[PDB]
Design a protein around this nucleic acid. Sequence first.
RNA 1: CACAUCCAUAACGUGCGCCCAGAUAGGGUGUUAAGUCAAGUAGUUUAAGGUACUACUCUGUAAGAUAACACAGAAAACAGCCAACCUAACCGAAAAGCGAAAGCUGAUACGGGAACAGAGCACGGUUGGAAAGCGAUGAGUUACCUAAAGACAAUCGGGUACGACUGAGUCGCAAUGUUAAUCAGAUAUAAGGUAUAAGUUGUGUUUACUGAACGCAAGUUUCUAAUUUCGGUUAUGUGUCGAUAGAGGAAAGUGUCUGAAACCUCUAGUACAAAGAAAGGUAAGUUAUGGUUGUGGACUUAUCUGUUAUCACCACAUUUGUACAAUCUGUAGGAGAACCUAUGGGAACGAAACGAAAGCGAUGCCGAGAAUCUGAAUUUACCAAGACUUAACACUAACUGGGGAUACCCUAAACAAGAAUGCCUAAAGGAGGAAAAAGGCUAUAGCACUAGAGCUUGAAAAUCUUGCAAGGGUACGGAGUACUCGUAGUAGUCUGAGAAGGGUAACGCCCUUUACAUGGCAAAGGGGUACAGUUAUUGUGUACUAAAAUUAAAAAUUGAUUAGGGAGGAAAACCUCAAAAUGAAACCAACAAUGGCAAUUUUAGAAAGAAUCAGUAAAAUUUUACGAACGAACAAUAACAGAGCCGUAUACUCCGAGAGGGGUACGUACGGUUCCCGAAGAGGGUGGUGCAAACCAGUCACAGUAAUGUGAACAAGGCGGUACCUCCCUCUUCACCA
Length: 447
Amino acid sequence: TMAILERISKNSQENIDEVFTRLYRYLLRPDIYYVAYQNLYSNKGASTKGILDDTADGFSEEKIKKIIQSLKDGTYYPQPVRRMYIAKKNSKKMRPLGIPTFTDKLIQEAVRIILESIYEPVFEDVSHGFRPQRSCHTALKTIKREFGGARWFVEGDIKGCFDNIDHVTLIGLINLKIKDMKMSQLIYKFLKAGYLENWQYHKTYSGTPQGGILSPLLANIYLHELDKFVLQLKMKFDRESPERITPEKYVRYADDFIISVKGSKEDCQWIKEQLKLFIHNKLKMELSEEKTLITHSSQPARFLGYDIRVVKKRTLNGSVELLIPLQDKIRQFIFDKKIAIQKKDSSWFPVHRKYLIRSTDLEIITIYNSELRGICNYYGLASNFNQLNYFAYLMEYSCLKTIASKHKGTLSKTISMFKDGSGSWGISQAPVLYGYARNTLENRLKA
RNA sequence: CACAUCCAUAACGUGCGCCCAGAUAGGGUGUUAAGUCAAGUAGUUUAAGGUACUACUCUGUAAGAUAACACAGAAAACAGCCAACCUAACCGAAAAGCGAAAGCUGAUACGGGAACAGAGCACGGUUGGAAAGCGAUGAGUUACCUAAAGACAAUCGGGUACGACUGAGUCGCAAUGUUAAUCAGAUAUAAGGUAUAAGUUGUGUUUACUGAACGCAAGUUUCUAAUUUCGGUUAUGUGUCGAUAGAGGAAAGUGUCUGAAACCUCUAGUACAAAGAAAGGUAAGUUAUGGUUGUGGACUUAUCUGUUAUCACCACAUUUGUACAAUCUGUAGGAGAACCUAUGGGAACGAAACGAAAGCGAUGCCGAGAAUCUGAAUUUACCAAGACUUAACACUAACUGGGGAUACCCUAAACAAGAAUGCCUAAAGGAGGAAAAAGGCUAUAGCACUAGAGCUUGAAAAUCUUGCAAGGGUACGGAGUACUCGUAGUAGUCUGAGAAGGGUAACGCCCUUUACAUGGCAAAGGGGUACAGUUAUUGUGUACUAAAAUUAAAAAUUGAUUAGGGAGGAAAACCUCAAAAUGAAACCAACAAUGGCAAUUUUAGAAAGAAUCAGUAAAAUUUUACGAACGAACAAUAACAGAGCCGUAUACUCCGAGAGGGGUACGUACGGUUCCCGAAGAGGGUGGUGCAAACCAGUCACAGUAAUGUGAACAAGGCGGUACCUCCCUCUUCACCA
């Protein structure tokens, strides 16, 4: 019943110099206090924002251990942190994750608590972004197309997020408030103890099984720290950058970061040089390739998918700058899709996926229609719907082709094509097709 | 500058598939010698050919029509194709009799049947002249907007593949090829197919491995790749601003309106030349995934007497080069969204795909048409299958004969073997004297063990347990080294081989010669025969010491760095005060710079050290060393599912001038290789899981003389069943293979 670090943060020595938020909060505390105390946690096994879509298995506020916490029953648990991560099929961001145990199954909400602590008159932007998003995909909807100050857009390179870390200034700078300088010593017990397990003995970095689903939480935290001084540069920053070109938005990805107004080049020098000034001075991972020598013109580039623009293509450009679904993505995409030969002669095709005893075309309908949606669905704003369409064309022929292939007939492609499918009205119907293709293209996508 | 829009069709995964001899059971393969066959008219040469002509006939010669000549052809058959058709092929249900039904008997009448391939053994036979597919409605049954925006006009105003969807008439391919006819030689080692497996990744471009049985050999299909408003909508339409002329000037440039510096109308989208623009056909090559090799329609190649003719002049289209349009014209760069340089619009800039990569060479083959040159022939000169018959020869299977061990499953098996009366009238005598059977007579009621049946009977029974040779089928896709079983035979002069030397391949295999007796053969399948191998399993270490850098560091230390520990409601507190309700006091964690065990680095002694002795000679089987592993690996337990490839052939086919490819189970035999190894059902015997029916006064009290019978007591005295879980369980799909 750790209803106490609540105190250890809230009370926290308000006479002898303590908690950073001595400037925003003395009364925003008790609300979130009771939230943790009883609301998000009255019963960790049940009252949680946890793993069984709300919690772990039913534990009487952890019927065994977090019955109590103070005595260090789960004292400094390391949960030996094996290197392990998850990459998602778009909008480049691997996932900081590791083996969550009943302990971690609630450390999740624990650090979520400390998050809301660092949140209420503290935070900005739940996970990556500056305009608080709820998924990369939502971030992928929202954060992009809002500003065109002055030209010559930017890129961003280095990782420093699963490979290079401090983890010690990390836990300290934040410990200066609840881990009070005096009379509060039950704080960092796992903030530290995300103890990585690859014969190496750092912690809380290697997609920590100590806190697994919250490894992103701490990662986001340290990234927020990066931006805590992206601040000072944004102060120094758009002073003349909205002047060098103007006569007629610092990015927080979870992997890449560019800025607001641009337009000159010596400024780009300033950019990368200050980058270097703190890239090690803060992260200890440093600029690669001088991150971009910020680009004068625009270019067909990559930035989590909706390319920065300051026969699988078409001219779409203007005074206002615009996303681009970068074919680049689509290349690997269709590749791993493993359905279109790249060239019998500069030529794309259907091929099922070397799957000979395939499972049932019904669940294949599911597989496709799903991926169809998700792909197109999360594929919100992007210029050139065109190649999206030509994709969809191929993608579709793929679907029913795979289908017929599942049945070993006499070249049954057109048979299926003009027999089933939404066109010939395949319930077994596949209305998640061209119809649904531009249904999505319009719904929640133009929106 | 757009929304809708995109070729079909066989083989690979079934039967019979083991072998030992066939050799017309069907047959087939090919080989030869004998007969026929039929060739627009006739004759010719004299075969009775031929096609060779003589003259004459017919067809056609679109090379965008038109007459004539001059050019090429003209049977007959065989093969074959689609339709439809005994339905005997050949199968099912009834069917049939048959262990006594395990099953076996199905053309029995019915149904299907060119069986999904039987080619490696056919449903036949039959007719006729035809079956998808693909193009274009052959007619129409829905929409669709009617040109100047829509207003009512359907102004049929005009749009039928106008559109949703039924009728294709037509084609063409399907509905085709076979045929013997001057004789050579040279430009073939000609220009070109061509050497040469295999699998197992490394797949990173690496030129690796089994054994690679050829080397050398890495960059790589391409666009990056129409710039004369082809600038802004993909690969068709599909709207537009810009370029120019606004046109009419909507009352549509059709009657009902606003059109205006205009909706809306075409547009106002190089310079020429050149050609053909020719439709079709004839022949070649390109064509959407389970891949490879095929099969059709569509995509490019060439292709189609000349003349006398009448032609009867075609555009457009494109080709090349000129324009400059290039968004630049990227590439790479410097540099206000538009700028600037060698590009050159292909120069890496990429992209992509890849393995002894490609590509190249290498020396083993084929290498038509005989392309042509030149010889020669040249009685119209020549003339011998094209088929189909006969006669004979030789090979012959997946067909015939001869087969046949390894257990299996189940039934009788009268086989056996085992399963034999419950108490009385109460010695004497009888329950079959009354008892009540039991076992048993028809779902067998009683969800369960004596059919509710009367009871018989009172071993019989009919019960279990076993065997079940019987029977039948299970097993013949081969199936590491290993012997045994079944046979040393009928396979046997004649081929894994006689004996061998040679070549002999990666590799056995076949050449020189040797017995007639297994001589060499060497029988089949299926079983048993150890370690490969195999996954699992632990046991034991992943040393057994000691040495080989520390990650080691857990630690002690210390850098004792590192400061600090005050109910939990608490918002400068309220904490509840107490040395001190702040020394953190001396407990908590901070990396440990030294130790730091270890993961281990490797040496390792390996060899009577652990993890084997085989310990022999011999002590008597010990045995130092030495051969000997042994954590410096041994043991336990199940299984080994053909996927190929190279070489000799029943035969095959198809694709081919042939090579050489495709397959025909890794193809059938003998080698030699590499790689066999699950799911999903599933269907068996298991246990447990649970429950409940009881034959069995096993319990009720007992009628009792007991028994037989009395529903609790099935309170599971018990098979069982009973549903879940448990596992070798193919009985079907998994790639037979990008």
